[PDB]
Amino acid sequence: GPKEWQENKSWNAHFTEHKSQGVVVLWNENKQQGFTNNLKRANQAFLPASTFKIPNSLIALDLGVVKDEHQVFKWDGQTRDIATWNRDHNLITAMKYSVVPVYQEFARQIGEARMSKMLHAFDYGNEDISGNVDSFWLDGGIRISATEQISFLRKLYHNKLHVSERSQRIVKQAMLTEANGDYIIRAKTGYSTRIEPKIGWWVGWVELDDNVWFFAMNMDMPTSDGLGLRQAITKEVLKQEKIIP
Amino acid sequence: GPKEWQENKSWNAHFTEHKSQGVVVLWNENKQQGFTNNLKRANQAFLPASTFKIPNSLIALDLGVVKDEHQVFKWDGQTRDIATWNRDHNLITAMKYSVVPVYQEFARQIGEARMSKMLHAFDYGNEDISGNVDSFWLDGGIRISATEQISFLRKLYHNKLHVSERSQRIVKQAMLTEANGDYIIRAKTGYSTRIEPKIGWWVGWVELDDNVWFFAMNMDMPTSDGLGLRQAITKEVLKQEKIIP
Ligand SMILES: *C(=O)N1C[C@H](NOS(=O)(=O)O)CC[C@H]1C(=O)NOCCN
Ligand SMILES: *C(=O)N1C[C@H](NOS(=O)(=O)O)CC[C@H]1C(=O)NOCCN
Ligand SMILES: [Cl-]
Ligand SMILES: [Cl-]
Ligand SMILES: [Cl-]
């Protein structure tokens, strides 16, 4: 009978066409079935890098570190390499421009004891926060696979994480990436650069009228010049599968 | 001293270019200033028609008539003129396809006494539900102006309406119309067809990185062939004002 996970190796052509290597994982929520070009890499756990902004946001909101999505976190005045980081942000714009220093402040205020407890409650990856509480997702011990990202996102979608429904709704709002009459994408990018292998991430879901497709992709990323391929390769797969036009 | 409300008659050219007549009203939230091509029509009160799905959704959720935005409302098997209505819906798709029969059932469950009480609590328009409990917003006594639509939407944006924050967040999600890196539009269309003058509505807001612009427009609409002009004329104004590219 039907399998929970199937391999579609033809998706490899979208990686090969872009001289890239990696994995796309899709989950069809209505059918409760998943699909991937590489089931082994789908289960390979990596540093989450900026995709950790999703659980970090949830925990900061539920503990009151962040009051709501419009509370301002002022620039600390240190000029950093990414110009959009050198300004004041709220939760929405800090996720959109992936403003690491704002989320490091969130993590410091959460603190290691509460961070560990909440990642255990979330069943999140290997749940390991060894390192600095404000960098373990960049250069510490936490690891999460693409399929574990989907597991986490499915709980978030259904408001079933062990945090308030309010925090889950706010974070799903902050994840909004694209919307038109054909679909809504809620997602977060990431780029793990400090520990080899350097990889790019894109995790989230596509909302249709009558279904939701969760996705999690990662790919080898030796330089930042290829970062647009995270979304491009994913969208090529979504187009091949007739999920988006 | 600066003016809270200012008239910009140059927007009339966008109506004339499309052989149309109507009003666009904008509110700049950061500046606390409003702008319109027609100050009198901005304050004239009309039937809300399908823009009433915003307060109706809020009331249905807060009263428990609708449990959440994924609860399925099954098609009643009656084949109606609009093909997208002849389907099962949830709150998200019922708002998107503006599925009147679903919202008439909400209104019947709410009932006259609770509907009236809640519209008074919302300060919604003239607060008058005279007529049929399931059609007063189409052919009964309720009236709301474009400026009153903005007032109501600003309360919704800030979670200040007299319903749970949860219901307000769910409805703001259901209002999602378009999103890209440049802006998010949350809005609801309507077409008042039963009492003259027939008018098209578009009410909502445009979220930018650092500001939000509320808008409410209505325009004479003798035929459904012109309904695309509601968004087109509004967007021409937003482009003229450099709010969207
Ligand atoms: C997170 O992965 N970040 C922050 C920022 N994210 O941009 S995105 O990859 O488009 O979401 C830039 C890349 C990455 C970092 O540079 N983080 O700090 C160093 C650890 N990789
Ligand atoms: C509400 O304004 N409705 C329902 C539907 N809305 O579509 S929209 O105008 O694009 O938002 C069509 C127009 C209008 C009605 O006609 N409603 O009356 C009951 C069905 N004729
Ligand atoms: Cl981060
Ligand atoms: Cl949203
Ligand atoms: Cl309606």
The data reach a resolution, in angstroms, of 1.5
Q: Count how many Cα atoms sit within 13 Å of the Cα of residue B90 in the half-sphere of its side chain.
A: 16
With respect to residue A245, please indicate whether it lies within any of the assigned structural domains: no
Is residue B200 within 8 Å of B218, Cβ to Cβ? yes
Residues of B in contact with A166 (CB under 8 A): 165-166, 169
Residue A44's domain comprises: 5-240
Mutate which of B50, B52, B132 for ligand 2? The one with the most ligand atoms within 8 Å of its CB, which is: B50
Residues 6+ apart with CB under 8 A from A51: A144, A149, A188, A189, A190, A201, A203
Q: Is A77 left (phi over 0), alpha (psi -120 to 50) or beta?
A: left
Determine, for residues A176 and B180 on separate chains, whether the beta-carbon distance falls below 8 Å: no
Does residue B135 lie within any of the structural domains?
A: yes
Q: Judge whether A174 lies within some domain.
A: yes
A57 is annotated as contributing to ligand binding: no
Exposed, middle or buried: residue B10 (CB in 10 Å: 0-12, 13-18, 19+)? exposed
Contact present, A214 and A154 (Cβ < 8 Å):
yes
| Phi then psi dihedrals of residue B31, to 5 deg | -85, -15
Number of CB pairs, chain A paired with chain B, less than 8 A apart: 35
DSSP string across B178-229: EEETTEEEEEEEEEE-SSSSPEEEEEEEEE-SS-EEEEEEEEE-SSGGGTTH
Instruction: Tell me if residue A10 is catalytic.
Output: no
Residues having CB within 6 Å of any atom of ligand 2: B 49-50, 98, 100, 138, 189-191, 193, 227
* Nearest protein Cα to ligand 1, atom 8: A190
Q: CB–CB of A189/A98 below 8 Å?
A: yes
Angle at B218 between CA B217 and CA B223, to 5 degrees: 135
Bridge partners, residue A190, by sequence = A201
- B102: Cα within 13 Å, side-chain hemisphere: 27
Discontinuities after residues in chain A (C–N over 2.5 A): none
Which residues partner with A180 through β-bridges?
A: A183
Classify residue B245: in a domain, yes or no: no
The Cα–Cα gap between A189 and A202 comes to: 4
Domain count, chain A: 1
Report the sign of the C-alpha dihedral through residues A37, A181, B57, B36, in that order: positive
Q: Ligand 1 pocket: which of A54, A103, A139, A191 to mutate (most atoms <8 Å of CB)?
A: A191
**B169 annotated ligand binder:** no
For B128-189, the DSSP string reads ---S-TTTHHHHSS--EEHHHHHHHHHHHHTT-SSS-HHHHHHHHHHTEEEEETTEEEEEEE
Q: Distance between CA atoms of A43 and A151, rounded to whole angstroms?
A: 12
Subunit contact B173:A173, Cβ cutoff 8 A: yes
Distance from CA of A223 to the nearest CA of B (A): 23
Q: Which chain A residue shows the shortest CA-CA distance from B70?
A: A158
Contacts of A160 (CB under 8 A, 6+ apart): none
CATH number of domain containing B213: 3.40.710.10
| Residue A176 lies inside a defined structural domain of this protein | yes
Whether residue B94 contacts residue B60, with contact meaning beta carbons closer than 8 Å, is answered with no
Q: Are the beta carbons of A176 and B179 separated by less than 8 Å? A: yes
User: Has residue B111 been placed in a domain?
Assistant: yes
Would you say residue A89 lies in a domain? yes
Q: Is B15 left (phi over 0), alpha (psi -120 to 50) or beta?
A: alpha
Closest chain A residue by Cα to residue B159 = A68
Distance CA B50, CA B82 (A): 15
Which 3 state secondary structure label does DSSP give B46?
Answer: strand
Q: Is A53 annotated as a binding residue?
A: yes
